[PDB]
Structures are given as structure tokens and as C-alpha cells.
Motif scaffolding. Structure first.
Motif, PDB file in Angstrom:
ATOM      1  N   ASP A   1      -2.279   1.542   2.444  1.00 35.41           N
ATOM      2  CA  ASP A   1      -3.232   2.534   2.955  1.00 35.41           C
ATOM      3  C   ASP A   1      -2.486   3.740   3.483  1.00 35.41           C
ATOM      4  O   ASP A   1      -1.253   3.727   3.517  1.00 35.41           O
ATOM      5  CB  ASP A   1      -4.198   1.967   4.017  1.00 35.41           C
ATOM      6  N   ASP A   2      -3.218   4.778   3.882  1.00 34.22           N
ATOM      7  CA  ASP A   2      -2.580   6.006   4.344  1.00 34.22           C
ATOM      8  C   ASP A   2      -1.520   5.885   5.438  1.00 34.22           C
ATOM      9  O   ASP A   2      -0.519   6.607   5.424  1.00 34.22           O
ATOM     10  CB  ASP A   2      -3.652   7.014   4.743  1.00 34.22           C
ATOM     11  N   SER A   3      -1.719   4.975   6.377  1.00 33.48           N
ATOM     12  CA  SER A   3      -0.751   4.795   7.447  1.00 33.48           C
ATOM     13  C   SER A   3       0.523   4.058   6.959  1.00 33.48           C
ATOM     14  O   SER A   3       1.515   3.969   7.684  1.00 33.48           O
ATOM     15  CB  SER A   3      -1.393   4.028   8.588  1.00 33.48           C
TER      16      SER A   3
ATOM     17  N   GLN B   1       5.309  -2.043  10.277  1.00 36.64           N
ATOM     18  CA  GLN B   1       3.983  -1.614   9.846  1.00 36.64           C
ATOM     19  C   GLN B   1       3.429  -2.541   8.791  1.00 36.64           C
ATOM     20  O   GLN B   1       2.286  -2.979   8.878  1.00 36.64           O
ATOM     21  CB  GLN B   1       4.060  -0.188   9.293  1.00 36.64           C
ATOM     22  N   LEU B   2       4.245  -2.851   7.791  1.00 42.32           N
ATOM     23  CA  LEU B   2       3.792  -3.710   6.707  1.00 42.32           C
ATOM     24  C   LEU B   2       3.472  -5.111   7.196  1.00 42.32           C
ATOM     25  O   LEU B   2       2.456  -5.692   6.823  1.00 42.32           O
ATOM     26  CB  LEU B   2       4.835  -3.730   5.591  1.00 42.32           C
ATOM     27  N   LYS B   3       4.329  -5.648   8.054  1.00 41.19           N
ATOM     28  CA  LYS B   3       4.092  -6.981   8.587  1.00 41.19           C
ATOM     29  C   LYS B   3       2.743  -7.010   9.288  1.00 41.19           C
ATOM     30  O   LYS B   3       1.850  -7.754   8.886  1.00 41.19           O
ATOM     31  CB  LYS B   3       5.199  -7.369   9.569  1.00 41.19           C
ATOM     32  N   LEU B   4       2.593  -6.187  10.325  1.00 39.09           N
ATOM     33  CA  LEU B   4       1.346  -6.143  11.087  1.00 39.09           C
ATOM     34  C   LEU B   4       0.140  -5.818  10.221  1.00 39.09           C
ATOM     35  O   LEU B   4      -0.847  -6.548  10.223  1.00 39.09           O
ATOM     36  CB  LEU B   4       1.441  -5.118  12.229  1.00 39.09           C
ATOM     37  N   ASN B   5       0.236  -4.722   9.470  1.00 38.93           N
ATOM     38  CA  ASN B   5      -0.854  -4.246   8.621  1.00 38.93           C
ATOM     39  C   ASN B   5      -1.150  -5.092   7.376  1.00 38.93           C
ATOM     40  O   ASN B   5      -2.248  -5.021   6.840  1.00 38.93           O
ATOM     41  CB  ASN B   5      -0.572  -2.780   8.245  1.00 38.93           C
TER      42      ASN B   5
ATOM     43  N   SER C   1       3.399 -11.284   1.173  1.00 42.20           N
ATOM     44  CA  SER C   1       4.802 -11.686   1.200  1.00 42.20           C
ATOM     45  C   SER C   1       5.784 -10.756   0.501  1.00 42.20           C
ATOM     46  O   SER C   1       5.665 -10.502  -0.701  1.00 42.20           O
ATOM     47  CB  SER C   1       4.953 -13.098   0.611  1.00 42.20           C
ATOM     48  N   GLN C   2       6.758 -10.266   1.267  1.00 44.97           N
ATOM     49  CA  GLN C   2       7.814  -9.399   0.742  1.00 44.97           C
ATOM     50  C   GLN C   2       7.379  -7.993   0.292  1.00 44.97           C
ATOM     51  O   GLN C   2       8.051  -7.363  -0.542  1.00 44.97           O
ATOM     52  CB  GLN C   2       8.519 -10.116  -0.416  1.00 44.97           C
ATOM     53  N   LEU C   3       6.270  -7.506   0.850  1.00 40.97           N
ATOM     54  CA  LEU C   3       5.748  -6.180   0.531  1.00 40.97           C
ATOM     55  C   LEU C   3       6.811  -5.124   0.826  1.00 40.97           C
ATOM     56  O   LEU C   3       6.993  -4.185   0.056  1.00 40.97           O
ATOM     57  CB  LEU C   3       4.478  -5.902   1.343  1.00 40.97           C
ATOM     58  N   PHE C   4       7.521  -5.282   1.936  1.00 38.02           N
ATOM     59  CA  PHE C   4       8.577  -4.338   2.286  1.00 38.02           C
ATOM     60  C   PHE C   4       9.480  -4.146   1.069  1.00 38.02           C
ATOM     61  O   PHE C   4       9.493  -3.083   0.452  1.00 38.02           O
ATOM     62  CB  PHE C   4       9.392  -4.877   3.469  1.00 38.02           C
ATOM     63  N   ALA C   5      10.222  -5.193   0.719  1.00 39.89           N
ATOM     64  CA  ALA C   5      11.139  -5.159  -0.421  1.00 39.89           C
ATOM     65  C   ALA C   5      10.494  -4.663  -1.723  1.00 39.89           C
ATOM     66  O   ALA C   5      11.098  -3.883  -2.466  1.00 39.89           O
ATOM     67  CB  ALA C   5      11.745  -6.553  -0.645  1.00 39.89           C
TER      68      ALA C   5
END
Ligand SMILES: O=C(O)[C@H](Cc1ccccc1)Oc1ccc(CCc2ccccc2)cc1
Lengths: 270, 270
Positions: free
Chosen positions: B174-176, B214-218, B223-227
Motif C-alpha cells: 500500500d502507499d505507506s 513497516q512490512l512486518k507490522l503492516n 512471509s519474507q516480503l522484505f526480501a
């Protein structure tokens, strides 16, 4: 309750300190004051600027004067670069004022857009005395003479500000005072384009009430100082207008340059 | 402290809303007919393209184009206006990134130079769906098919972008989320020419931390969205590369067409 105001003053002063590197207190020491332990590099002549720009931690360009890139332009532009750094410092301070971040986002931008030049010249006074202004985080000093001996358009550029500074500083305010004053400035209410003035004037009424007490308790022998400070808002406005003026006069000296596309983009006007 | 990080995200998301008129959220709302408060006009051929100048705000040509800048050319000179427009905005989003203005002027230019198109293609995905992309602030919708049926060359400009988007939107950011990613992209450090690097990498390191929280909380369940997101940065590099060489072909098959200044300066070769 007076306790509420005294509280708001401390908060604002706290953020101010955190938000701004060079404080008036600190700047006053370097200046006329003694506190001699790390004297600044005085720039009084063309050789002073040259023979001292490869040693200063200023970010723009190395010292080179020989029918290539004039000093007058390098100085004016160098002033913009810093003015832009300052804007981020102010924007962060605004966000620390109670109620600010809760306002319509569009109004927030409107308030920062019009309040920034007023804040800049206000703080520029903290770094000036009748003989000159501190430069590069206070590492150097640029006399008022050298500046007045610059190019035709650029010679009368910093003179009206030297005059404002002298009168403004006569008020002898300190950082704790400036903190609140700067906030009053941001929370105007007459800026063009606002969508919901009510909350803005509500917050400003609160900041004004705090300022009144801050001045009365910090300058007991300085009667009606509150009124004197608000009257200065007239001079600042003229200073800001008169400034966009010469600015446009410069917008007709140097322009079309296929090397400043992305650089001139980062430096619009404010 | 994960508290400061959350504060940095909030900050960034705020400047993001303030620099981009068309957020992903407004865009999806328009793309999903569920909300007909204002539906878009669709372009999937010449007729609809003709009826397009009508309601949509177009200053270009409406009738025949064979003897007055063919359709393809018409579409891409407008596209060119949007890019310079996006750059000016991204350029504005950048200044709000803590520390970016304090860096070396030369490096600032280097950073914007290599990051600008990578950002445009990232944000351009917020306006596409499998079938097409929104145009003119969301008032229109141009068919992926129409675009692909354009003249020999021009018809290869958008397809690769649609492919990136279909998979990239799969991430459902999302935008944030985009705000921080957009920032991580600019403050690279491995960019060519960078006079410095350590100061630049200190800021990115900080940005990466915030994006990570942000990714963790949001997106707790992703799983592994960051990477996965960082790997996407690889897809952007390639796209910028096929784009450049294509750009070069037009520069040769159309001696009449002219790549805008602010875009020619950013572009280079090899
Ligand atoms: O490279 C760029 O900065 C832009 C980036 C872009 C592409 C698609 C959507 C948004 C932004 O894409 C192009 C591609 C081709 C052109 C050609 C401009 C042109 C077309 C017709 C006649 C003269 C010039 C301009 C920009």
C-alpha cells in the motif's frame, strides 16, 4: 492555567534545540563575544574567500577564480543551498507543535510554504551583528563590507537583512523566546488557500498566550515586549516581499543552462 | 528503538501524500468499478481515442494524425510530459528524506540521476492492472492491447512495464509501504561516480530498517516480503536498460522528435 503554558514553552524550546544545530546562544559566543577556543576564518577580501574555500567544509564548489564562474554568483547560489537545508529543519520543528500534524494535510503544506522565508530571516539575525554574518555552521565569518562590494544586483541583496537584524537583535530575545515566536509565525491563519482556519487560529491563540507569559517571566524589566515583537512581523513581511523582488531581477541574469536541469530542480524558490 | 523507526515511516508516508496527487489508493478505487463516483473513459482504439479529447483534458490533437504527428507520436509526447512531471515530484519527495540535503551536492545529483526512472516504473504499477493503465490523473484508461498495437517501435515501450507490474502488484503493497521503498531506492551508494559513500549508506541502512519494520507490522502474514521486495529492485534495473536502448532507436528513426532537456541530461550510455 499558567502551568499549561509554561509547559508548552518548555516543549517548544526542547524541540527547537534538537531541531537546530547553531543556536543564538552558541552563535553569540563565537561573535563579538570572547569564548576564544576555536576562532572562525574571516573572509574580508577576494583573496580571503579564495585562500580559504579549500579549507572550509562548505558544499558547492572548490575555489577557482580566473574568468571562470564568478564569485558573486557562487555566493548567492551557495546561500540557496543552505536555505534549503534549513527548510527541512523548520518542517521538522513545525511537526513538533501541538495540533499541527492533526490539521488538514493541504493546510500544513500551505502553512509551511508561506512561513519558511519569515522563519529563515528571523534566525539569520541570530548569526548577524552590525559587521557581518557567521558562515558554514559558524566555522567562518563573512564581513558586511565584502558583501557590499559584490556584483551590482548582489551588492544590495543582503543589506536590507543586515538592517532588520540590527533592530531585531535590539530586542535581546533568547532561544527560549524565539522558539515560541517561530511557532506563532507558522500558525498564522491569513495564509492564502487555507481550507479550515478555525483550528489554526485556535492553536495560534494558545501559542500567543504562551509567548506573552514567556516574555513577561523572562524579561520582567522589558515592558510591552510582547507588542514590540509582534510589530516586527511587519518588517519581516516587507523583507520577504522585497526579497522575491531582487530574486526575480536575478532571474534575468543567468537562466538557460543545460547543466543545471536536475540541480535547479532541487532549488525552485523556497 | 523500534519507536524511532515507526516515527520515520509516518514521516515519509506524510511527505509521500504531499508530493503525489495520485496515490495507489485513489487509483485502485477508480480501477474497481465498485465506486462509480467518477468512472474513467476507456481508450481501446482510434474512435475512443477521438472521443477522448472530449471529456478528458487533452491539449493535443483529436482528429486525423497521419499528416500531423501520427497517433503513436501523439501518445508519447504526452507521456514525455508526465515523466518530467514525475521527476520534479520525486525530486521533491527526496528533499524530505532526512539527510539527503546535507550530503555532497554532486552526489545528490548522482543519486537522483540513477534512481528517477526506477521510481517511475515502481509507481507506474499503481496505475496498471492486467488490462491497462490509468491516464490524466485517473480520468482515462488506456488499453494494454491498444498500446501494444502501436507502430513497430513505440509498441514495445509499455509491454515490459505491464509485466513488471502484474507480478509487482501481486505483492499487494500500500502507499505507506511504497513511501519507504521509494526512499531506499534513491539512497543507494553503489551508484557510479559517488564521490562519497559512507554517509550515503548510513542513511539507507536506516531506511532499510524502517521498511523492515513497516512490512512486518503492516503485513504480519506475508512471509519474507522484505526480501521479496528488495529482489524487485533487480527487475527495475533491467527495465531501465531495455528502455534506454529503445530510446536510442527513436533518436535515429525520428530526427524530428526531441527528448526533453531534463530527461536528456539524466540519460547517458553504457
Ligand atoms: O524515458 C522516459 O523518461 C519516459 C518514462 C515513462 C514512460 C512511460 C510512462 C511514464 C514515464 O518514457 C519515454 C519514452 C519515450 C519518449 C519519447 C518522447 C517523444 C515521443 C514522440 C515525439 C517526440 C518525443 C519519452 C519518454
Amino acid at each position: 492555567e499558567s502551568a499549561d503554558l509554561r509547559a508548552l514553552a518548555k516543549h517548544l524550546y526542547d524541540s527547537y534545540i534538537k531541531s537546530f544545530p547553531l543556536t543564538k546562544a552558541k552563535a553569540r559566543a563565537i561573535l563579538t563575544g570572547k569564548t576564544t577556543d576555536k576562532s572562525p576564518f574571516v573572509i574580508y577580501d577576494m583573496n580571503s574567500l579564495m585562500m580559504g574555500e579549500d579549507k572550509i567544509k562548505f558544499k558547492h564548489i572548490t575555489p577557482l577564480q580566473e574568468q571562470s564562474k564568478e564569485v558573486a554568483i557562487r555566493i548567492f547560489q551557495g546561500c540557496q543551498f543552505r536555505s534549503v537545508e534549513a527548510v527541512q529543519e523548520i518542517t521538522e520543528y513545525a511537526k513538533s507543535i501541538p495540533g499541527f500534524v492533526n490539521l488538514d494535510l493541504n493546510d500544513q503544506v500551505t502553512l509551511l510554504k508561506y512561513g519558511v522565508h519569515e522563519i529563515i530571516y528571523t534566525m539569520l539575525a541570530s548569526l548577524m551583528n552590525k559587521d557581518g554574518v557567521l558562515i558554514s555552521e559558524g566555522q567562518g565569518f563573512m564581513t558586511r563590507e565584502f558583501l557590499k562590494s559584490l556584483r551590482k544586483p548582489f551588492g544590495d541583496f543582503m543589506e536590507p537583512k543586515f538592517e532588520f537584524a540590527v533592530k531585531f537583535n535590539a530586542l535581546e530575545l533568547d532561544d527560549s523566546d524565539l522558539a515560541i515566536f517561530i511557532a506563532v509565525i507558522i500558525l498564522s491563519g491569513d495564509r492564502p488557500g487555507l481550507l479550515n482556519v478555525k483550528p489554526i487560529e485556535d492553536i495560534q491563540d494558545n501559542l500567543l498566550q504562551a509567548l506573552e507569559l514567556q516574555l513577561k517571566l523572562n524579561h520582567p524589566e522589558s515592558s510591552q515586549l510582547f507588542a514590540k515583537l509582534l510589530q516586527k512581523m511587519t518588517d519581516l513581511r516587507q523583507i520577504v516581499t522585497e526579497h522575491v523582488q531582487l530574486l526575480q531581477v536575478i532571474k534575468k541574469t543567468e537562466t538557460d543552462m543545460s547543466l543545471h536541469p536536475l540541480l535547479q530542480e532541487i532549488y525552485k524558490d523556497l
